[model samples]
Target chain A: MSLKVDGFTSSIIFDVIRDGLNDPSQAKQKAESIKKANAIIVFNLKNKAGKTESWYLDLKNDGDVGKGNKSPKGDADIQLTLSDDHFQQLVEGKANAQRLFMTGKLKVKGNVMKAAAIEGILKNAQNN
Target chain B: MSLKVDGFTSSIIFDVIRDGLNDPSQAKQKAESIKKANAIIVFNLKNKAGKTESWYLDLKNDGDVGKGNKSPKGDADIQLTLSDDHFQQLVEGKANAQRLFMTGKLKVKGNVMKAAAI
Candidate 1:
């Protein structure tokens, strides 16, 4: 089993804003939605089998998500390590991200405020 | 009523390959599937409202799909234009891409074989 990051699904959701910020449609508004949050996040996901996958998200500038660590802008404002299933649950609305954090399932390094901001964007993503 | 490229969906599908080729997992088999095809395709989708949208795909090297007219390599191996709904139908298996080409509903400006491959 590998990291079930739904790297594909996450990329699509992230791209909606990444691509939107780069060019955009419908007034290019999605870009602005994340721009203000101003944080870059890197997620390292692991699986039961010990397979690890990395995902990078740049929310501070040009929004984007991709495999591996770090964005083009440098390091992450928030670096998170968690299980792939946990992340899937977070985005799909199955699990509570904050609860995961408090319970030690989700580990973070960097701005906790930025982490809270990430939750905001992700919630809106699931809504759309 | 803009170009219904489903730009988001298209990027996701293409990224599965793009990202797969760049790295990979589960034997990374998809990269080989498109590698042999070897064509960069760009789609320009339009709606009845006259709004146009662009999507670029590079199948030759680093496969990627995004909103724009060209890939990092320069021009497209194939440039195709059609209605947003038509493209959606084609991808979802609702419409036949080749049939659209023959009927003139899909406008192709680059390699006919490349378009045929899609």
Candidate 2:
């Protein structure tokens, strides 16, 4: 399945991810917990047609979260790769994180432990 | 909390990992499933005192597994970084993979999703 986010350009994808995390309730919790790790995380998504897009998200002090399509200035603690379809499945809770991981549908590099929180963020966003 | 596999030099550590996966039950299953991915996975482990060791494990046809300390000649699909203590916990089933990953105790690079299988 192709991922057709209504306005699915790279920036839009960035917004989708950033906005989801920026929601008031989640933002507070995410900031408090994620700030300790002090990491910038990158997401790389590909479509069925072979196009790829990237976005970087940073966790900082004072409950701030930032993201952009360009690669972040420095190193990222973790990076994730997956197809748009699988990403959608993950966000929508249609896929099991562990299963997706084991089957190679999702690949994680950098800090595997830090990436676990991203999974929670995706699922939690869906519920909000 | 230190990883003290007796005779734990770099080679011994490689042997420990290889031997664990090579166990008849796990070896058969890992070979069948991992061989399809056709990737070499590298593990970089650090000790508390700051020494580091790396090993590359290759998954090939019919469940054959090979590993070495020197870098593999080709690219690796996944590279994992962690401390020796944590590595031992994982191998001994004392720690949860998901939990280890979330806490930053484990780091993965290269083909994040494909690295998932490795």
Best by DockQ: 2
> In candidate 1, residue B35 scores what lDDT?
66
Model 1 pairs whose backbones collide:
none
lDDT of 1 by residue, B1-118 (tens): 1222443332222332233334433233335445676788887777777877777767666555566788887578888898766764554334556799899988989887776675
| Deviation (Å) of A26 in candidate 2 | 7.0
lDDT of 2 by residue, B45-97 (tens): 78877877666766533333344343445556678888887876564334556
Report the lDDT of model 1 for residue A112.
Answer: 39
Tens-digit per-residue lDDT, A43-111, candidate 2: 778887787766666654332234433334566655778887777676666865444554667776653
**DockQ of each two-chain model:** 0.01, 0.04
Tens digits of per-residue lDDT for model 1, A1-128: 12224433343444443443445342244455455556777887777767766767666675665557778776776677888678768767776554566566876666432453455555432233
Quality class of the docking in candidate 2, CAPRI style: incorrect
Best prediction by TM-score:
1
Q: Residue pairs in steric clash, candidate 2? A: A106-B113, A107-B112, A107-B113, A108-B112, A108-B113, A109-B108, A110-B108, A112-B101, A113-B101, A113-B102
Residue A85 alpha-carbon offset, candidate 2, angstroms: 0.4
Poorly placed runs, candidate 2 (over 4 Å): A1-14, A20-27, A60-73, A123-128, B1-118
After aligning candidate 2 to the native by TM-score, how far in Å is the CA of A88 from where it should be? 0.5
